[PDB]
From Swiss-Prot, chain A:
Name of this protein: Large ribosomal subunit protein uL14
Record organism: Sulfolobus acidocaldarius (strain ATCC 33909 / DSM 639 / JCM 8929 / NBRC 15157 / NCIMB 11770)
Cross-referenced SUPFAM superfamilies: Ribosomal protein L14 (SSF50193)
GO MF annotations in UniProt: large ribosomal subunit rRNA binding; structural constituent of ribosome
One GO CC term, this protein: cytosolic large ribosomal subunit
Gene of this entry: rpl14
Curated annotation (Swiss-Prot), chain B:
This protein's record includes keyword Phosphoprotein: no
Swiss-Prot/TrEMBL keywords: Ribonucleoprotein, Ribosomal protein
Record gene name: rpl13
CDD domains according to UniProt: Ribosomal_L13
Pfam families (UniProt xref): Ribosomal_L13 (PF00572)
Domain of life of the organism encoding this protein: Archaea
Any one biological process term the GO annotation gives: translation
Family: Belongs to the universal ribosomal protein uL13 family.
Binding partners and assembly: Part of the 50S ribosomal subunit.
Function: This protein is one of the early assembly proteins of the 50S ribosomal subunit, although it is not seen to bind rRNA by itself. It is important during the early stages of 50S assembly.
Native organism: Sulfolobus acidocaldarius (strain ATCC 33909 / DSM 639 / JCM 8929 / NBRC 15157 / NCIMB 11770)
Gene Ontology cellular component terms for the protein in this record: cytosolic large ribosomal subunit
Protein name: Large ribosomal subunit protein uL13
GO MF annotation terms: mRNA binding; structural constituent of ribosome
Curated annotation (Swiss-Prot), chain C:
One GO cellular component term: cytosolic large ribosomal subunit
Example GO biological process: cytoplasmic translation
Cross-referenced SUPFAM superfamilies: Ribosomal protein L6
Name of protein: Large ribosomal subunit protein uL6
Subunit structure: Part of the 50S ribosomal subunit.
Organism field: Sulfolobus acidocaldarius (strain ATCC 33909 / DSM 639 / JCM 8929 / NBRC 15157 / NCIMB 11770)
UniProt keyword annotation of Ribonucleoprotein present: yes
Entry keywords, A to Z: Ribonucleoprotein, Ribosomal protein, RNA-binding, rRNA-binding
Single annotated GO MF: structural constituent of ribosome
Listed InterPro entries: Ribosomal_uL6-like (IPR000702), Ribosomal_uL6-like_a/b-dom_sf (IPR036789), Ribosomal_uL6_a/b-dom (IPR020040), Ribosomal_uL6_arc (IPR019907), Ribosomal_uL6_CS2 (IPR002359)
Transport recorded as keyword: no
UniProtKB/Swiss-Prot annotation, chain D:
Gene Ontology cellular component list: cytosolic large ribosomal subunit
Its job: One of the primary rRNA binding proteins, it binds directly near the 3'-end of the 23S rRNA, where it nucleates assembly of the 50S subunit.
Protein's UniProt name: Large ribosomal subunit protein uL3
Source organism of this protein record: Sulfolobus acidocaldarius (strain ATCC 33909 / DSM 639 / JCM 8929 / NBRC 15157 / NCIMB 11770)
Subunit structure, as described in the record: Part of the 50S ribosomal subunit. Forms a cluster with proteins L14 and L24e.
Pfam families assigned: Ribosomal_L3
Length: 134, 140, 181, 339, 55
RNA sequence: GUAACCGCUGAAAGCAUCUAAGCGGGAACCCCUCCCCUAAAAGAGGCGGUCAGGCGCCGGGGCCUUCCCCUAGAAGAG
RNA sequence: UUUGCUACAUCGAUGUCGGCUCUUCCCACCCUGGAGGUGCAGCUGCCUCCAAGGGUAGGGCUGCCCGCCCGUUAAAGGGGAGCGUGAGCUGGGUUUAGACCGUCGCGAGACAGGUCGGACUCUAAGGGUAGGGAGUGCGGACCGCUUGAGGGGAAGGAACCCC
RNA sequence: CAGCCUGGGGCCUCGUGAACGCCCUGAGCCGGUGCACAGUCCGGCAUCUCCCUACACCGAGAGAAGACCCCGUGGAGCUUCA
RNA sequence: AAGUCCCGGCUAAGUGCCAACGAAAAGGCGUCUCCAGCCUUAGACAGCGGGAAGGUGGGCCCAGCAGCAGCCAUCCUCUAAG
């Protein structure tokens, strides 16, 4: 959307059926990645995702009105280390996503925890509600 | 026996070369790029482009391999199909040499032609062997 | 049917020097000179009389007599070209974005069509003069083919507006021929 | 049911055989490229690798005018020795044979290092006087001029050898007569790297890659290993079928030699040419190589070959862009490579 | 038409009396041709211009 | 260099007409450029250098194993 | 490329479903490239012609094949090679011997109906292929440098974003 | 979506020392012919000789007078309303 | 092994170079040939300039279709002209 024009590609951190935490107050707590938007691959390979990628998730744990429903989300944190163009390696404590509306605005009104800058640059509406950006 | 291949039909000339070879003679074919082939340009090219597998060519003449695209190779490959398939047909094939232009050592010698292979025999629409090799890949 | 004998005459006017040698016919005149080879006219005898051109053939089928009458039209075009010039007009039609055209040596460059930043370029054949007056383009010359081919190259380069769009009349189009000069 | 998957490996690289020489020469050379007489290549030795911090030069780059981190390879390049002058022509048969070679070492350039490779000319056979007038007589039908050069390995102690390598490098520039004059001035002299290249240029690297011996099909072609049970089940590191037919059972993967192949690279940029080796040597030496003590090149990215591999550097034959000077370097990693 | 006829019954210089379309092969033909120059079909039709005003 | 096709000049067939003669354009296609193997190419290529000296003999030049090794390596090879 | 019809070949045996692995081909074109028509304003559609250089993926259900469905994608085309490939694997299906049920039979027993359990042999004369060494020829014994007939290649393909 | 490491083999050398395939040694391949899928026949295109390791695609590869199916005025065991 | 044999014609696609053996309906004035019928120096065909038409653009129905929207007739200022 806004920063893909740089080298937007990192270590392949997440897959299909990988679990993530939902880092916002939308109601969900845990989810499972169902689809990766944009990937097109080769024989036997599972589609991958890293920071600032749009994904489809299915909520496995949360409030009754969001449990077992499919949403769009972007990856904001990842455990596996990735390198910034100025040569620094970053690593987070868990894999997390934030759930967005179809037009890109966050569904929740608050984001818990730190956010990578590549996610804040590509998704301006998320950066508007994020408090700390790393 | 020196054969001048200027303005001569490729197939008609080759049948006289083969009989000369079969009688135990050495045949030099000079001006091998000036012989003609009847038909339009497109007609002749697909006659030779359906043999293509792959592309490149990389020396002085000498091989004679599955895809001739040199004016010397084209003339030699045409004669080879008219020769006997026994062991003599291989010994006799070594007595034929084709050149582009007249070499230095054959400059002042008498050449022959065959009057029933002349370009005057056909209504028109032919190409030269040099023009064919230009499109096949030989720089000539 | 086979026409047993057919013969035609082309009158050479004054101020014109016609030369014929080994099937090559060249015509010299005030406006210029034209050289054309007629080696492909098999079965046709071309005679250079003292004051006219003579073309003869016998037992012509539908294809030999079709050839003979095209050679006649070519010769009469050479004579006309060296006495009077050929002048084709092209019109410049634009809807919203004005079109700019300019001549640079042996090339015509067309820019700012329906808005695109590509520059369209057209070849100019030898012996031809191209000038831009305004909303019109004028192509000069003695050989009719070179004048016609050059004006058609300008015509063809600007067609590309005719891709992916319902035509709203944007391009450069041929207009007329044959001013006295 | 017969999904689609691309074939494993390139069909254009077969045979994957061992290279027949350690220093290959290019078969083709870049065009004149509108210059004045100069050589179109140089010879170097691969030392090691490190990383620098430069400010980006590419005006179209996303990181323009910013400090970015780049790996680099270090290539040690002493001067070479110009040995002979070689002229090519289209001979009878219409080929590209060699007309004559004009050697010049006797006036100055009496070397026995050169006799470790060639038991070269005696004083009796220094009749090179009439080789030169043959070149001048047969001028105007000469197509290419090439200079035979020799490396000087005895100037590199970490490279424990003294016999040299002999290659020929092409001259591209003005006229043929102009190129003959330039080639006679380099003859018997020592050619620095700065007479050929300059900082910021692009190059093409030709050499031999690191050898790896007889190998399987999972390393040679990256075929897929048999999944689950078959990981447990009668042999997994193999292909199932070897073709369908008796048509000369075809070009399918087989085990064999991996590495030590002649390859080529494109568009490798030179970032720095240095003489002060204290700015490039890491603490404790380059691991498994030694210390740099000659002129060196800093080439960004990777280079084929192992340490102490002779590399041929050539002008770019399909260049991507045309750089200008000064990719400014702000940091060089001089830390130890052990631990 | 983006490529008119030089001195003919050409149009876009203030007309729209366009060309003729073959129904078999699809090629363009002259306004006064009787059969296609590619296949010789005689199954020809006119290009569509526009509906001028109304009924 | 062409495919489908688009155009010019032009008759057969006074006109018209991209085609019949005669020309010009025109694709991830084909050939060259580029990369890899190439003088067992039978037309089996080219170029620089060594094979001291004395009277078959004396004397001598070269290459390999052995010796110390690794850039290479299943043995060979390099 | 289905299913039938025939009974020419194999009955002192050509291992009989599906899957995996790997290779290649056809074109009757799904996407990528070119051109045109339209009841083509633009965006998106629909249709016709050339073209096989490149691509055509991940999962849930069933032994499957077909098929239905989930989230994507430029598109997730369709076929052949003894229904390519068991001296490469597997062994879910199927067609032995054990056993249960339903229907049928006086019975022993049968089904083309369901269900549980049930073995996968071999050290490669020859060819082919992948690589690595010597010899003879060219051409008396050696050291070094080359050319570029010929041969192979997909060495690149595609999408998203900026203006 | 594979990578690295270890024991025993394999690889090179000394000693002991078999078996199956075998009309023939004459077996490169593509298109055909022909009981209808040829190493040997026809037409082409190829092909200098020997040795080592590795692979098992082809030799309708090796191994067993097909258990399936049908026939024979061949059997054997079981059954009963023969 | 024996004809680059002779005469009259056709084909431009490499069609074809096939006794038994491999192509239909349909389309082509592409070109070559034979039959019909109808116009031609009392000026044919095509083309070119003009007359290129008038009461009337008659009209029924209609604000109006002023051939050609729902049925249709049919009269001369005329002669080198409608």
């Amino acid at each position: 959307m806004n920063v893909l024009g740089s080298r937007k590609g990192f270590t392949p951190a997440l897959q299909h059926n990988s679990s993530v935490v939902v880092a916002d107050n939308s109601g969900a707590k845990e989810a499972v990645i169902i689809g990766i938007y944009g990937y097109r691959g080769v024989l036997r390979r599972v589609p991958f995702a890293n920071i600032a990628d749009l994904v489809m998730v299915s909520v496995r744990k949360g409030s009754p009105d969001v449990r077992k429903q499919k949403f769009k989300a972007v990856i904001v944190r990842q455990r596996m280390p990735f390198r910034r163009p100025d040569g620094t390696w970053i690593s987070f404590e868990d894999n997390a996503v934030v759930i967005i509306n179809p037009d890109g605005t966050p569904k929740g009104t608050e984001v818990r925890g730190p956010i990578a800058r590549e996610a804040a640059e590509r998704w301006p509406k998320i950066a508007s509600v994020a408090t700390m950006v790393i | 026996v020196i054969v001048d291949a200027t303005n001569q039909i490729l197939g008609r000339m080759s049948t006289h070369i083969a009989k000369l070879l079969k009688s135990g003679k050495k045949v030099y074919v000079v001006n091998a790029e000036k012989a003609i082939i009847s038909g339009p340009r497109s007609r002749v090219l697909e006659g030779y482009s359906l043999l293509f597998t792959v592309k490149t060519m990389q020396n002085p003449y000498r091989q004679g391999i599955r895809r001739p695209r040199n004016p010397i190779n084209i003339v030699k490959r045409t004669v080879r199909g008219m020769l006997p398939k026994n062991k003599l047909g291989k010994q006799i094939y070594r007595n034929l040499k084709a050149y582009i232009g007249i070499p230095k050592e054959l400059e002042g010698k008498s050449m022959i032609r065959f009057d029933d292979a002349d370009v005057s025999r056909l209504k028109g629409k032919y190409i030269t062997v040099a023009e064919l090799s230009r499109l096949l890949g030989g720089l000539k | 049917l086979k026409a047993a004998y057919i013969r035609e005459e082309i009158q050479i006017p004054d101020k014109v020097k016609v030369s014929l040698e080994n099937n090559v016919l060249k015509v010299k005149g005030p406006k210029g000179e034209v050289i054309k080879d007629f080696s492909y006219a098999k079965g046709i005898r071309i005679q250079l009389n003292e004051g006219k051109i003579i073309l003869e053939t016998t037992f012509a089928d539908r294809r030999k007599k079709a050839l003979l009458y095209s050679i006649i039209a070519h010769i009469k075009n050479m004579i006309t070209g060296t006495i009077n010039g050929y002048r084709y007009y092209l019109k410049v039609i634009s809807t919203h974005f004005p079109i700019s055209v300019k001549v640079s040596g042996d090339e015509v460059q067309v820019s700012n069509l329906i808005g695109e930043k590509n520059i369209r370029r057209a070849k100019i054949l030898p012996g031809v003069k191209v000038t831009v007056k305004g909303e019109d383009i004028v192509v000069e010359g003695s050989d009719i083919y070179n004048v016609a081919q050059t004006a058609a190259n300008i015509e063809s380069s600007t067609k590309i507006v005719g891709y992916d769009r319902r035509i709203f009349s944007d391009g450069i189009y041929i207009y007329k021929k044959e001013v006295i000069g | 049911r017969k999904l689609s998957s691309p074939r494993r490996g390139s069909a254009g690289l077969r045979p994957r055989k061992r290279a027949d020489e350690i220093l290959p020469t290019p078969k083709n050379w870049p065009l004149v490229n509108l210059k004045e007489p100069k050589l179109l290549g140089f010879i170097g030795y691969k030392a090691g690798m490190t990383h620098v911090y430069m400010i980006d030069d590419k005006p179209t780059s996303p990181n323009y005018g910013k400090e970015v981190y780049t790996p680099v390879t270090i290539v040690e390049s002493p001067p070479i020795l110009g040995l002979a002058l070689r002229a090519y022509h289209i001979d009878s048969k219409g080929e590209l044979s060699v007309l004559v070679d004009y050697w010049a070492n006797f006036e100055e350039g009496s070397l026995k290092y050169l006799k470790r490779k060639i038991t070269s000319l005696k004083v009796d056979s220094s009749k090179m006087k009439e080789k030169l007038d043959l070149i001048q007589k047969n001028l105007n039908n000469i197509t290419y001029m090439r200079l035979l050069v020799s490396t000087q390995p005895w100037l590199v102690p970490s490279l424990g050898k003294k016999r040299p390598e002999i290659v020929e490098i092409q001259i591209g520039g003005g006229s043929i007569q102009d190129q003959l004059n330039y080639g006679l001035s380099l003859l018997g002299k020592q050619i620095p790297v700065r007479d050929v290249f300059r900082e910021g240029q692009l190059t093409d690297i030709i050499g031999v890659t690191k050898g790896k011996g007889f190998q399987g099909v999972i390393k040679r072609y990256s075929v897929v290993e048999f999944p689950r049970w078959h990981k447990h089940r009668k042999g997994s590191r193999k292909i199932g079928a070897r073709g369908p037919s008796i048509s000369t059972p075809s070009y399918v993967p087989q085990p064999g030699q991996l590495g030590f192949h002649r390859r080529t690279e494109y568009n490798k940029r030179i970032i720095k040419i240095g003489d002060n080796v204290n700015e490039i040597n890491p603490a404790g030496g380059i691991v498994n190589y030694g210390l740099v003590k000659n002129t060196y090149l800093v080439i960004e990215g990777s280079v084929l070959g192992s340490r102490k591999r002779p590399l041929f550097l050539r002008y770019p034959i399909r260049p991507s862009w045309s750089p200008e000077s000064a990719p400014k370097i702000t940091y060089v990693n001089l830390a130890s490579q052990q631990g | 038409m983006p490529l008119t006829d030089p001195v003919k019954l050409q149009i876009v210089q203030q007309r729209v009396f366009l060309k003729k379309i073959c129904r078999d092969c699809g090629a363009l033909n002259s306004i006064r041709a009787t059969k296609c120059r590619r296949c010789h079909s005689s199954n020809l039709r006119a290009k569509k211009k526009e509906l001028p005003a109304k009924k």
